[PDB]
Amino acid sequence: AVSDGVFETMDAAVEAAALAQQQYLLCSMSDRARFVQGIRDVILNQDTLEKMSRMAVEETGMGNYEHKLIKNRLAGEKTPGIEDLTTDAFSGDNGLTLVEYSPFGVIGAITPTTNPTETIVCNSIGMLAAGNSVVFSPHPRARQVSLLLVRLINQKLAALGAPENLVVTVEKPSIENTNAMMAHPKVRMLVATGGPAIVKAVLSTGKKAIGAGAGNPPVVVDETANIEKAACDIVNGCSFDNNLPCVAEKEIIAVAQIADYLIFNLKKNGAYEIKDPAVLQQLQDLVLTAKGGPQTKCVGKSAVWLLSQIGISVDASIKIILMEVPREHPFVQEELMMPILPLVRVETVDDAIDLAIEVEHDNRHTAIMHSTDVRKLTKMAKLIQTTIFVKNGPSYAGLGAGGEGYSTFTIAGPTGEGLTSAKSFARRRKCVMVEALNIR
Amino acid sequence: VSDGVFETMDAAVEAAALAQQQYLLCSMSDRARFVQGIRDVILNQDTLEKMSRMAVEETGMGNYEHKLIKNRLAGEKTPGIEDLTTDAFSGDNGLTLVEYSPFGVIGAITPTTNPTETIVCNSIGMLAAGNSVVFSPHPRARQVSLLLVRLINQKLAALGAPENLVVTVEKPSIENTNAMMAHPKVRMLVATGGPAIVKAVLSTGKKAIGAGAGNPPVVVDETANIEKAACDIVNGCSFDNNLPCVAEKEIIAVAQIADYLIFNLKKNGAYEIKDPAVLQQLQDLVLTAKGGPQTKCVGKSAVWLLSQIGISVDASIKIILMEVPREHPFVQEELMMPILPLVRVETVDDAIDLAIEVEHDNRHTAIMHSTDVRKLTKMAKLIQTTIFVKNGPSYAGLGAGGEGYSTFTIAGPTGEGLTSAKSFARRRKCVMVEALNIR
Amino acid sequence: SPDGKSVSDGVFETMDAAVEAAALAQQQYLLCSMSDRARFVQGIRDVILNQDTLEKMSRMAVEETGMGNYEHKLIKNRLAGEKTPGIEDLTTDAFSGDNGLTLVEYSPFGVIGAITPTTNPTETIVCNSIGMLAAGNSVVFSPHPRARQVSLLLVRLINQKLAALGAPENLVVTVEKPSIENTNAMMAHPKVRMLVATGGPAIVKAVLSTGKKAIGAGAGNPPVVVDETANIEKAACDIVNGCSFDNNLPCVAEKEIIAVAQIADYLIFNLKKNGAYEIKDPAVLQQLQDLVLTAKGGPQTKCVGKSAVWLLSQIGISVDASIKIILMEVPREHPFVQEELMMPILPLVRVETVDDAIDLAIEVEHDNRHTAIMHSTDVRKLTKMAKLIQTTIFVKNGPSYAGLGAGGEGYSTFTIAGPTGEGLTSAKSFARRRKCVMVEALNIR
Amino acid sequence: VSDGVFETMDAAVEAAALAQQQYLLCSMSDRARFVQGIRDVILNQDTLEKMSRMAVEETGMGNYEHKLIKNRLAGEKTPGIEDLTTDAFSGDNGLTLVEYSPFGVIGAITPTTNPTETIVCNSIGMLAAGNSVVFSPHPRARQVSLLLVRLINQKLAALGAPENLVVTVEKPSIENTNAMMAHPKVRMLVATGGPAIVKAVLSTGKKAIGAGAGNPPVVVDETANIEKAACDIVNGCSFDNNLPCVAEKEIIAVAQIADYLIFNLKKNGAYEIKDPAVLQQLQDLVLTAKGGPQTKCVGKSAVWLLSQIGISVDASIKIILMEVPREHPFVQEELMMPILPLVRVETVDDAIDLAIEVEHDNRHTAIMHSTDVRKLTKMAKLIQTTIFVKNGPSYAGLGAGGEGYSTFTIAGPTGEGLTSAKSFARRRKCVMVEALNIR
Ligand SMILES: NC(=O)c1ccc[n+]([C@@H]2O[C@H](COP(=O)([O-])OP(=O)(O)OC[C@H]3O[C@@H](n4cnc5c(N)ncnc54)[C@H](O)[C@@H]3O)[C@@H](O)[C@H]2O)c1
Ligand SMILES: NC(=O)c1ccc[n+]([C@@H]2O[C@H](COP(=O)([O-])OP(=O)(O)OC[C@H]3O[C@@H](n4cnc5c(N)ncnc54)[C@H](O)[C@@H]3O)[C@@H](O)[C@H]2O)c1
Ligand SMILES: NC(=O)c1ccc[n+]([C@@H]2O[C@H](COP(=O)([O-])OP(=O)(O)OC[C@H]3O[C@@H](n4cnc5c(N)ncnc54)[C@H](O)[C@@H]3O)[C@@H](O)[C@H]2O)c1
Ligand SMILES: NC(=O)c1ccc[n+]([C@@H]2O[C@H](COP(=O)([O-])OP(=O)(O)OC[C@H]3O[C@@H](n4cnc5c(N)ncnc54)[C@H](O)[C@@H]3O)[C@@H](O)[C@H]2O)c1
Known part of the structure; x- marks a missing residue:
């Protein structure tokens, strides 16, 4: 029937989120807002909130239920939506100039085993608010909890009218599919959230790469x-x-x-x-x-x-x-x-x-x-x-x-976008209305 | 006093690294004085017209009277330290500040299309953000690029700037570009050229900004x-x-x-x-x-x-x-x-x-x-x-x-748009928990 | 082409006591957090967006004033409850350099006197209160006599919700009998720090001649x-x-x-x-x-x-x-x-x-x-x-x-200030700007 | 060519009235030129010193060396046209612009404490906003204010400005201050003084900015x-x-x-x-x-x-x-x-x-x-x-x-804070339904 977002091949997972992105270019800002809100209700649903929090712990053997209950709720409530996409304006004698935040295309996201559900919710909200689709590459230790979240999002977005496969992943998350995703031509930007090995890897791909490194x-x-x-x-x-x-x-x-x-x-x-x-x-x-x-x-x-x-x-x-x-x-x-x-x-x-x-x-x-x-x-x-x-x-x-401030789970130290938001998953575009609409 | 032009690539990198580590200990007014120095060097009519002919003469591209406007647009409408704004959010949990801090040393690759305009552009933006810039110009714009780098290095020394904020190589070539790419001490790469140099800086394991071509x-x-x-x-x-x-x-x-x-x-x-x-x-x-x-x-x-x-x-x-x-x-x-x-x-x-x-x-x-x-x-x-x-x-x-500001590094593939000082800075957050909430 | 192209209830019998109660409410409101403000603004929003009172408030205004229609007022009351800016309207400017850090903030005014019209009786109470309370103020309302009961009713449900939420009493007050006399009484009270007039040219002319800061939202054509x-x-x-x-x-x-x-x-x-x-x-x-x-x-x-x-x-x-x-x-x-x-x-x-x-x-x-x-x-x-x-x-x-x-595109308002220059009034329009200079500190860039 | 100083208050207002009409046909570059002209006037060294001795000697208050710093501070750090920002938000219902537009003729009442710092600061802010200013200065600082205004008109005359953008009366007093406040053609009052004049301008039936006193x-x-x-x-x-x-x-x-x-x-x-x-x-x-x-x-x-x-x-x-x-x-x-x-x-x-x-x-x-x-x-x-x-x-x-900009009119009661050019402007909203949403 409708796609569940999970595919058997990274290549057609990229091709599926490549068709979704273009269809997604026909959806209004209000569609994004419903989709973004749909992702929030998926995780902030009290039955799902407790389910993802304990199951992640059960599968990863890391963290505790009470705290991922808070972290997951932080990713759902304090992740910016389409309000993040502001518009700069400069009006003068030469008319007007607008600067917008516009879709990249298809994003490949590599998520860790320490914030499996948190990073996916945090990425999907921002990457979809900016008009992108996202191909996820979860850590294989968090495979079961991540695909289920991927599936729960697909169901909700289907019930809202979203194009199929705005959020996708693979059935067998591996180190090979992660490399495959970093090489695929249709993937436009890479977002890496992990250690120093993976951050330097997305920086060697010939693509735009957000690098969220380790700390101490x-x-x-x-x-x-x-x-x-x-x-x-x-x-x-x-x-x-x-x-x-x-x-x-x-x-x-x-x-x-x-x-x-x-x-x-x-x-x-x-x-x-x-x-x-x-x-x-x-x-x-x-x-x-x-x-x-x-x-x-x-x-x-x-x-x-x-x-x-x-x-x-x-x-x-x-x-x-x-x-x-x-x-x-x-x-x-x-x-x-x-x-x-x-x-x-x-x-x-x-x-x-x-x-x-x-x-x-x-x-x-x-x-x-x-x-x-x-x-x-x-x-x-x-x-x-x-x-x-x-x-x-x-x-x-x-x-x-x-x-004070919004919440993120992809913190860019090397590449230097700071606490990434929907602006981080968008292209900066400038529009010059020459000698018109200077209505000051 | 160094002239900002070194015999090999590793010499210029190691000197800009020591420069930026010394540039950190400067004030924002120092940055503003060095920014204005860079503007002064190109906006001076004697040098402006010298830079406009040598680019047309050596590269064999464009005309002089139009490069006169392009070099002027760079040193005039390029954002300075006023581009580095500050975001604040205050409430019950305190005060949050978001600032644009240095990256470190930046490697810059420039085209034969706009040799000088791009040097003027990257210098102001990277130095205003507190960085140092290692330029790797195209060989067909070598002598004019080296002349401009020395004039800047000369000007900044008379202002009290640490030496080697803007550096380059005596013998620019393709392999010096590739040595600047592999040097572990380069934090950011900015490339203004063809589609092959952009994907090359994007394949070096480093933070890279690529200004592609079009039609x-x-x-x-x-x-x-x-x-x-x-x-x-x-x-x-x-x-x-x-x-x-x-x-x-x-x-x-x-x-x-x-x-x-x-x-x-x-x-x-x-x-x-x-x-x-x-x-x-x-x-x-x-x-x-x-x-x-x-x-x-x-x-x-x-x-x-x-x-x-x-x-x-x-x-x-x-x-x-x-x-x-x-x-x-x-x-x-x-x-x-x-x-x-x-x-x-x-x-x-x-x-x-x-x-x-x-x-x-x-x-x-x-x-x-x-x-x-x-x-x-x-x-x-x-x-x-x-x-x-x-x-x-x-x-x-x-x-x-x-309307808007001027740039000669327009990032398509990497999404920054019309790059300015902010584009060459790290976004840093500072949380004063439960204090400085003065509303 | 000729073709074109293709506990207090909030209501006081005297005007002065409404101001004195609103001033006491200002004292206590200053001790409340931004989260309290957010919960009180969110309280007002539920008051009008609750479907039963939403229908209820819409028929009133038509019955009491004889003006407007019910279905469109159902749209205006929802538009004020949804699209009026809250405490997120209170943004912060910051300037950082060699001399340290300077912040500029929107801070409360104190007690505000608000004069509402009969054409938008409940929409202006919703919209004024949200922004004025978000900015940390208390508001005294002098409604138009024609829409007395619908305005009096809304202010009571407001004082009930806010009370249930632990707000200081009399955060939003009014009089028992609205009149032009009670308006002049509010205009002359020294404890009223700002005036907001939303009405014809005569009422806007008055608030600007009282010796107080005034926001005059006049008439249009x-x-x-x-x-x-x-x-x-x-x-x-x-x-x-x-x-x-x-x-x-x-x-x-x-x-x-x-x-x-x-x-x-x-x-x-x-x-x-x-x-x-x-x-x-x-x-x-x-x-x-x-x-x-x-x-x-x-x-x-x-x-x-x-x-x-x-x-x-x-x-x-x-x-x-x-x-x-x-x-x-x-x-x-x-x-x-x-x-x-x-x-x-x-x-x-x-x-x-x-x-x-x-x-x-x-x-x-x-x-x-x-x-x-x-x-x-x-x-x-x-x-x-x-x-x-x-x-x-x-x-x-x-x-x-x-x-x-x-x-x-934008937020909603029902107090549109032209001659006084505030534009489409929101929480910023109801707050004072303060500058906090931290000399040679907190410059972390 | 008029020098901006008039015998009656009504003659000054009507002159500033017609001048503001003619101002509305000028460009942002025109405003920028006049503002920079008022900066050059006060920042001229001989004029900077002249204003400072003339004020102290005519009023008997303050000291030369500090009114040098303050007059410099008013022409050097008062916001210009850059203060008039644009807001914008686009989406499905199109584009909305928010802009700062001029009121009209504004009447400004300056104090004896800072006679020159306020005229420089006010006039730059209100001309940047596209308004004209009628000044009613303090009688104790009478000749220093007329000479400052006259020197300003001469500069604006040379720059090509409409006559009488900054005007004043030959005989300042409080009698013509009341004439100013009671003139139908004035649209805002800006009182910078004690608590009396602040309540006075707020009782005029007109928009007014009142910068009171403090301890x-x-x-x-x-x-x-x-x-x-x-x-x-x-x-x-x-x-x-x-x-x-x-x-x-x-x-x-x-x-x-x-x-x-x-x-x-x-x-x-x-x-x-x-x-x-x-x-x-x-x-x-x-x-x-x-x-x-x-x-x-x-x-x-x-x-x-x-x-x-x-x-x-x-x-x-x-x-x-x-x-x-x-x-x-x-x-x-x-x-x-x-x-x-x-x-x-x-x-x-x-x-x-x-x-x-x-x-x-x-x-x-x-x-x-x-x-x-x-x-x-x-x-x-x-x-x-x-x-x-x-x-x-x-x-x-x-x-x-x-950090921040300077002012010499600080609105406490009226709440504008440090009045700048933005303070003397009307916020307008401009809604392009279902168009120019190019995100
Ligand atoms: N800065 C941030 O935003 C952030 C957030 C969460 C976790 N982390 C860091 O993650 C680290 C621990 O989490 P982790 O166990 O998931 O680390 P990890 O690097 O092993 O896993 C991160 C992701 O990158 C993949 N990956 C790792 N090495 C790879 C390689 N050589 N080739 C291809 N893919 C590779 C993994 O499959 C995984 O999906 C910590 O150091 C933590 O600081 C950083
Ligand atoms: N987006 C912008 O801001 C901008 C501005 C000017 C020019 N351009 C584009 O640049 C191109 C014209 O300039 P160009 O001819 O100098 O481009 P280019 O490909 O030569 O790139 C410029 C730099 O890249 C180096 N380079 C190129 N190929 C290399 C290789 N294989 N190995 C190592 N180094 C290499 C060159 O040494 C040169 O210094 C046009 O395509 C133009 O659209 C873009
Ligand atoms: N600019 C805006 O945002 C806006 C919004 C809504 C309505 N309006 C205007 O309001 C008017 C319609 O409402 P209205 O019928 O209630 O008009 P109105 O001017 O009579 O109402 C003004 C309010 O103040 C009272 N009032 C009126 N004149 C007064 C006076 N001289 N002294 C003291 N109090 C006085 C009234 O009782 C009423 O409560 C229209 O002119 C409309 O354009 C403006
Ligand atoms: N808030 C600020 O930005 C600011 C700036 C400078 C001075 N001040 C204050 O001004 C005072 C010192 O200056 P000042 O001696 O000129 O004050 P002032 O009140 O005696 O005079 C101020 C101006 O307003 C006029 N004026 C005063 N009372 C008037 C009245 N009843 N009717 C008509 N016109 C009247 C005066 O003619 C004068 O031009 C101090 O209190 C100082 O705090 C405030």
Whole structure:
């Protein structure tokens, strides 16, 4: 009958979303608004919201239901629609000039295993608002949850009158189909949301490519910060979706003056402090791999789970695992994506800033600071040059939750569009009405 | 004090990298002083006219008095640091700021079409955004490009700028372009040229902006002002000898006004060719062995072209006109010459459809002349070009006779449009949670 | 071509107590978050967009005022509830450089006194309250006596919803007996920081002579110009739909046609084709003018907002419900041209050229600088009359209500300020601009 | 050629009436040329200096060196035609443009405090908007305003402007100010002065912009850079001898750092009066029987104010500093003298609430020196002034040391804020139904 959006071949998946895009060029702005709203109701439906949130966890073995229940709702509510497509206007003696945001064509989107449903909802809303179709390439670990969402969207858009196959994917998401999608001529723009290997891959294809890379965000806490509030926002921001967010705090850098009071307020807020060098080393055997990287089995796991594996039984109060280590520690250097939070002590905030730049590894992604000194907040904000910089709040404030602005799950650091929206999936066009319609 | 011109490619890259790391420690007023310095170098009449002849002399393309306007339009209507605006959103959750920060060192590739205009354009926009620019000019514009880079480097040193903000190579060539592409220390690539260099910077694993080519059609219908349309068409097509990426390249005339349009094209300096044999002869000259325009004719005047087929002509003639079918290579192949075929159609509604077809999905430039709002709306929306000019010459889309700012790096494939300082900057967010909400 | 182309309830017995209660409401509103404002604005929206009260509020205004029709007011009440800007209208400007960061913000005014008309009684209460409360203000309403009960009723459902949402009491207040005296009482109260007048030229003249900041949304007399290049078929349909909209009550609705002579006759045919009753007999035209005009040359109160079928019945002409307006071709000095009848009566004046049309439309506008419409296809003539007539709203090739967001691009409003320069008023129009300079800090670029 | 100055108010208005009609036929480039002409007038060095001595000498208020900075600030950072932005939104129902269009003839009433800065600032804003301006300046600054207007007409005459775009009366007074406000052909009033003239223009049945007065307090808290705070408060309070409506007029310092603040304020040229006998001598000198400021002392230097009480000191002194209770008249009155009282409070929240109290709900200007981003936000969000400067001099709220544009007409009651060209324009909406939606 109607297409379910899922095809057996990447080539005809691209050819199907290529025909959809052209048909989609006949649909009015109001059609886009109904389609965009149709995608919101699909995920914000309470039966679907709870279903995608827990099933993703069931299939990926990462994150938790309660938090992807919030993240999925953030992608549905705070993702911009067709209002994002603004129009610049310049009226003068030479008439008028309009600048619009117009469809690219067909977009290929490569989505991660840390925000499988969130990224698809966030991409599809923006890419369809800008008048594009999208060919998705999900991470094969999130294959089942992603295609089902792809299918749920196709059904809703069919009931609204949309052209078939505005959102599509493949039945067997693989590394080969992802490469196949990057090579297909009809694909006009690529959007990559993942690690450094995939971001550099879409940049080598001869096509327009949005690159959302990895992070390693430090959170500086100087003597000026509200230590009680700082330690609360840290635990919440680090335990959020079990540290899967690319913004989630992954190492603490505190000045010696307030460090012991920070650790005390951190434990008070649900941190389990590891002080014995043996159980710490015992923890490194659990969560690390060969080549000193993170184990995907431990990635996205809870603090209850990780301490269960080293013979420590704690209740549900424990949200993170705390330890004060040197800066060379692998938990500091690596993007653990786990509620494991090291803490490096430094003499002054200037040393905390100069170190936070180093452990950023030039990712230019996310950095957090707790401090009420404007001069010190703007010195770190200027020097580290990250795409998102949160101040006196949990890191998820930079995604629109607890912070001002809209929400996105594709954050462009390398290619540099920042928090991508519908403007990011559109071509910039200029229209010059010479010596007419200067009605000032 | 360095001159901004280095012996090898790795030397210029490593010096711009040290420059931008030092450029970061500057203020916005320093950026504004260096921006004005770049404007001063080209807008100086002594240098302006030197840059306009050397480009015509060395490359052998265009004329000097039109490059006089193109070089001026670049240093005059290019956005400066005022292009870097700030977005703010305040409420219960605090204050959000969105800024345009530096990328780092930018590698820039320029065409033989507009050597100096593109250097002036990229320098202002990239340096205003806090970047440094490593230019890799075409070998056929080498000596004028190196002269302009040194004049800028000289000027900026007298303003207190860190050295090597604008750098280039002593021996520009194809392989120096490829060494700038592979250099890990280049953060952004901007390419203003053919379709092969654009896909090459798009295949290097780097952030790349590609300003592609086109084939701009101009549609005329029974509703247009025919006298002003034929003046705007000849002026646009013959601007800098049809070198600009925006200049008209073929006409599509509604049959109802096609004859009266051909008369007013003549009255405004168009030389029509009616004998099919003399129209063979120019196909022999400008089109070469296997169907592509010949680089020796590209950028030459209409008088120079008519002389090569033995037609001595006064400087009144600005273009070579001919009524011709839609399959003739003069309509399909981007000539970049003051040769302007015309295709006659019955209707305006597939005058539009024919224009979309001959544009060849470049979605670059299209022009239309008329009085009906719905018809200008219909063609401007369906053809989906980056620039669409209504009731004026093509260069009106460059800030010359139209509203908006000026650019010589118009990104088609990569979607930035008329690139400016913002186009060469990283969008960064800054969230002050639960503070600075002063409403 | 001759063818064209193809807990308090909110209501107080005295005016002063309404202001004193609205001032106390301002004190407490300043302690409420933007989310509270958003929930209170969203509260008002549910008040009018709830289908039962939506039908309910529409029949009232027709029953109490005798003006307009029910189905079109069902459209105007929904248009105010949906397309009026909320707290998203309060945007922020930011400037960042070497000297730090400067923000400019829209901040509340305090207590606002709003004077509403009888032609749009509930639409203006919805629209004023949304933007005024979104900007962080409290509003005192002085309704027109003719639409007393429908206005009093809406303000009570508003005070009930907001209370149920935890809003400070008396955020939106009014008087128990609206009167011109209670209007002058509001104009003179020192606690009222701003005035907003939506009515005739006399009420706008008053608010600007009180010693307070005032937004004056005055009257209109919009002409509609059709030249030989217009889509005459579409022109006639838009003109009849726009003129008859809510029985010509809107300040935007068409009031007189200025048609180029070449297409004027074909235009009339397509006006009749779309439900215009053409009056040719000199005598029966006198009957309507004797019925519609008063001794002072102004419109008849008992006839304002009455249907075209109702007006034709009173002169002894029975017609079916397909007739929406009344059409007569008359000279330019005819009263129906010079007066804002606010009735489905449409005069047409024929002119030689489009140049003459643009000039007479300027002459007929009466310097209201409010609304003007022109159906035309040439960009140069559209540009000429738009730039020249200088109206607050200018509509091209559409119905007049496209300047309200109905079939046009933008937000809706029912307070359209011309002589005071605010344009189509929204939350920004009801707020003060504040500049916050952070010297040599927060420049993070 | 007319010089713009007329014998009667009615003759000036009618001249500005017909001039504004003729103005409506001019282009944006024409407006741009006239605006730049008014910039060149005041920014000319000899004219910049001339205006500044002539004002001080004719009014007896302010100092030369600071009115040099301020007159430069009005011609250099006042918005031009770039201030008149266009809004636009397109979709299915077509295109909608929003534009800023001129009112008509505007009447502007300038004050003695800044006679030249307001004429330069007003005239640039209202001509940029396409309006004409009839000026009714203060009689105390009578000949400096007519010479400034005359010099302006000569410049506009040379540029090709319609005669009498900026006009004034030969004999300024308040009698013809009323004539201006009661003239049918004036369309907006712009009153820049005290609370009387503001309510006067708002009672005329006409659109009016009223820029009232204020009593700006500056709050210092324990987080403030005391060496930098004490420096900025002296530069800001003694700026033009406290004449600017923005200039600090009383300090509210927390007890923790109040003595070290006064310690560092004297390093910057403060004179502490500790003997109530000497202090009362100032009181009887500068206040009035009913406690108002004395016109003879307004704008007088601190050196001169101390000479009227015998105390002789050099020009190193810039202000007269006194620690004093809150109810004292120096705190409560907009003195516009370099007299700066200090009110010590215990906590920053006492300072915040007190600065709210002494501001008298003028909601005009307030300053705060502090490093805590929470306290800066708390006072800004509560005092609700149209200018709020943080960690800098008062005049940083007028583009001199801060971000943004400058103005000299600050609308507090009427709510326009820092009036620019946009303030003197009507918003018009232009709806193209079902056309020009080319997205
Ligand atoms: N900046 C952002 O917006 C953002 C958002 C979510 C996740 N991430 C990052 O993703 C990373 C972890 O998620 P992940 O496990 O899905 O990483 P991942 O790179 O393994 O997977 C991302 C996607 O890219 C594909 N991919 C990866 N390598 C590829 C290759 N060599 N060739 C072709 N395709 C390839 C994968 O199939 C997958 O679909 C983290 O580093 C996180 O920072 C970034
Ligand atoms: N969109 C714009 O802003 C713009 C402006 C001017 C010209 N153009 C286009 O550029 C073309 C004319 O300029 P051009 O002849 O110099 O184009 P081009 O193909 O030569 O590209 C310009 C640069 O690319 C380099 N280059 C080209 N091929 C290369 C290769 N195989 N390997 C390494 N480097 C290579 C050249 O060294 C040259 O410096 C036209 O197509 C015109 O439409 C576009
Ligand atoms: N510009 C706009 O946005 C807009 C919108 C709707 C209606 N209007 C105009 O309103 C008028 C129709 O409404 P109306 O019948 O209520 O007219 P109206 O002028 O009599 O109504 C003005 C309101 O203020 C009261 N009022 C009238 N004159 C007053 C006076 N001299 N002093 C004090 N109060 C006075 C009235 O009781 C009424 O409540 C039309 O002229 C229409 O153009 C304008
Ligand atoms: N808000 C601002 O932007 C701003 C700017 C400069 C000065 N001011 C204020 O102005 C005052 C200092 O200047 P000033 O001495 O000229 O003030 P002022 O009130 O004495 O005079 C202002 C102008 O308005 C006229 N005027 C005053 N009262 C009038 C009345 N009742 N009727 C008719 N005309 C009247 C005066 O003739 C004069 O031209 C201070 O209070 C200062 O705060 C405010």
